[PDB]
Design an enzyme around this catalytic site. Structure first.
Site, mmCIF file in Angstrom:
data_model
loop_
_atom_site.group_PDB
_atom_site.id
_atom_site.type_symbol
_atom_site.label_atom_id
_atom_site.label_comp_id
_atom_site.label_asym_id
_atom_site.label_seq_id
_atom_site.Cartn_x
_atom_site.Cartn_y
_atom_site.Cartn_z
ATOM 1 N N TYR A 154 0.844 -1.211 0.115
ATOM 2 C CA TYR A 154 0.088 0.004 0.027
ATOM 3 C C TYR A 154 0.771 1.300 0.064
ATOM 4 C CZ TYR A 154 -3.479 -3.371 1.276
ATOM 5 O OH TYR A 154 -4.367 -4.642 1.346
ATOM 6 N N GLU A 161 5.183 3.362 0.584
ATOM 7 C CA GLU A 161 6.606 3.099 0.749
ATOM 8 C C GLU A 161 6.729 4.164 2.190
ATOM 9 O OE1 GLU A 161 9.621 4.247 -2.256
ATOM 10 O OE2 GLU A 161 9.839 2.343 -2.077
ATOM 11 N N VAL A 162 7.295 3.817 3.323
ATOM 12 C CA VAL A 162 7.684 4.398 4.464
ATOM 13 C C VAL A 162 8.906 5.093 4.336
ATOM 14 C CG1 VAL A 162 7.311 4.481 6.955
ATOM 15 C CG2 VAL A 162 5.700 2.994 5.340
ATOM 16 N N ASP A 212 -7.467 -4.319 11.084
ATOM 17 C CA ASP A 212 -6.049 -4.815 10.569
ATOM 18 C C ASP A 212 -5.158 -4.770 11.993
ATOM 19 O OD1 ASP A 212 -4.149 -6.062 9.121
ATOM 20 O OD2 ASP A 212 -3.254 -4.269 8.184
#
Ligand code: ATP
Ligand code: AU8
Ligand code: AU8
Ligand code: AU8
Length: 327
Positions: free
Chosen positions: A48, A50-51, A154
Site C-alpha cells: 500500500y 513506501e515508508v 487490521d
C-alpha cells in the site's frame, strides 16, 4: 439469505454525528507543503505504501512519511478522515500533515515518529506484567476508535508501535479502517490471514467492531503461548480448520446456523469433527511464566466464533487479567 447482524455497542455513533464526520468522499483535503519535509531513509515498503523517516525542517522534528501507492491513494480520503477524526485519542498515531509527493504524484501522509523497540526483542522478552500492560494500552485505542464509530480491521503486532523505554504504544496503519454503519455489508478481504475472524472466513459481510477483538485475541494467544501464529493456516480455508481444531466444530455449526450461513462445500473434505479444547492444553514449561487462570479466561472470552458473543473493548478493560496493571 443470511440473518442480519448489528453491533451490540456504538451502533448509533455515525447517525448522531453530522454527515461531514463519516462521509469521507465529501471531505476536502487541505494540502501541506512537501518542501517542509526532507526524507532521511527508507524504512520499508508494503503493498500500500513506501515508508520513510524524515525531518520536518520548519520545526526540526523527526517524522514518518507514508507515500501511498495508487491502490491506497484512491481510498485516501477514508484513511485521512479516520486519522483526523481519531487524532488526539489515546494511543492513536498522530497524522501531522498530508502532502503531494513530487516524484510519485500521490499523497504522502506525515505522522509523528515513534522510536519503536525491535519487535523480535519485545516478543522474546516482554514479561507477563508487560504483556498485560500493553494489552490494556491497545484496548484504550480500540475502545476509543470503536466509540468514534470506526473499526480498525487490521489489528496485528506489526501495526502496533511500542517505545518500550518510555512505555509508549501507538496503533498505526489505518489504511483498512472503516466507519461502522449498522446493516452495511463490508468486504471480507480485510486482515492478515492469521488474524482473520471466523466471520471473514465464512464470508459473513455484516460484521462490526468485534472483528478487532478476535484479532486482539490471536495476538494475545501467540504471545502468551509462545506459538507464532497461534492459528497457523496454510490458506483461508485451512485457517478456519485450524480454528476449529481449537474451538471445535459444534460451536462453528452453531455459529453459522445462527446467521443462516452455509460453509463452502469444499470444507467437506478438510474440516472433519473436532471437540472444543480446554485452553490449558496449550500451556507448557516454556510458556507457563506468561500464562495465568485470568489470561486463559480472558482469551476464552475474545476467541469466540460468534462475533456478538465476544467481549467488547470496554468490557475487556474490566477483566481480572488487568487487575495487576498499574492504573
Ligand atoms: N509513526 C511511525 N514511527 C515509526 N515507524 C513507523 C511509523 N509508522 C509506520 N512505521 C513503519 O512503517 C510501517 C508502516 O506500515 C510499520 O510497520 C513500521 O515499520
Ligand atoms: N510491533 C511491536 C509489537 C510487539 C509485541 Cl510483542 C506486541 C504485543 C504486546 C502484547 C501482547 C501481544 C503482542 C505488540 Cl502489540 C507490538
Ligand atoms: N458433514 C461434512 C461431510 C460431508 C461429506 Cl459429503 C463427506 C464425504 C466426502 C466424500 C466422501 C464421502 C463423504 C464428509 Cl466425510 C463430511
Ligand atoms: N504463571 C503461573 C501459572 C500458570 C498457569 Cl497456566 C496456571 C494454571 C494452572 C492450571 C489451570 C489453569 C492455569 C497457574 Cl494457576 C499459574
Amino acid at each position: 439469505g443470511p440473518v442480519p447482524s448489528r453491533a451490540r455497542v456504538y451502533t448509533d455513533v455515525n447517525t448522531h454525528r453530522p454527515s461531514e464526520y463519516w462521509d469521507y468522499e465529501s471531505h476536502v483535503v487541505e494540502w501541506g507543503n512537501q518542501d517542509d519535509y526532507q526524507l532521511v531513509r527508507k524504512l520499508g515498503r508494503g503493498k500500500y505504501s513506501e515508508v520513510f523517516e524524515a525531518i520536518n525542517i520548519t520545526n526540526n522534528e523527526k517524522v514518518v512519511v507514508k507515500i501511498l501507492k495508487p491502490v491506497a491513494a484512491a481510498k485516501i480520503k477514508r484513511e485521512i478522515k479516520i486519522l483526523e477524526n481519531l487524532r488526539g485519542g489515546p494511543n492513536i498515531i498522530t497524522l501531522a500533515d498530508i502532502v503531494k509527493d513530487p516524484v510519485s504524484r500521490t499523497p504522502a501522509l506525515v505522522f509523528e515518529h515513534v522510536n519503536n523497540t525491535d519487535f523480535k526483542q519485545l516478543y522474546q522478552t516482554l514479561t507477563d506484567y508487560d504483556i498485560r500492560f500493553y494489552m490494556y494500552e491497545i484496548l484504550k485505542a480500540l475502545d476509543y476508535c470503536h466509540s468514534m464509530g470506526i473499526m480498525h480491521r487490521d489489528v496485528k503486532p506489526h501495526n502496533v508501535m511500542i517505545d518500550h523505554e518510555h512505555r509508549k504504544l501507538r496503533l498505526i496503519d489505518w489504511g483498512l479502517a472503516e466507519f461502522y454503519h449498522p446493516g452495511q455489508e463490508y468486504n471480507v478481504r480485510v486482515a492478515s490471514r492469521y488474524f482473520k475472524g471466523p466471520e471473514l472466513l465464512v464470508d459473513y459481510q455484516m460484521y462490526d467492531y468485534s472483528l478487532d477483538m478476535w484479532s486482539l485475541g490471536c495476538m494475545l494467544a501467540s504471545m502468551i503461548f509462545r506459538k507464532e501464529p497461534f492459528f497457523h493456516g496454510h490458506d483461508n480455508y485451512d485457517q478456519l480448520v485450524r480454528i476449529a481444531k481449537v474451538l471445535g466444530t459444534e460451536d462453528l455449526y452453531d455459529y453459522i446456523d445462527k446467521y443462516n450461513i452455509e460453509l463452502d462445500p469444499r470444507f467437506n473434505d478438510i474440516l472433519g469433527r473436532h471437540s472444543r479444547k480446554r485452553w490449558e492444553r496449550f500451556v507448557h514449561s516454556e510458556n507457563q511464566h506468561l500464562v495465568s487462570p485470568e489470561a486463559l479466561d480472558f482469551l476464552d472470552k475474545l476467541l469466540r466464533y460468534d462475533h456478538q458473543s465476544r467481549l467488547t473493548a470496554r468490557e475487556a478493560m474490566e477483566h481480572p487479567y488487568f487487575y495487576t496493571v498499574v492504573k
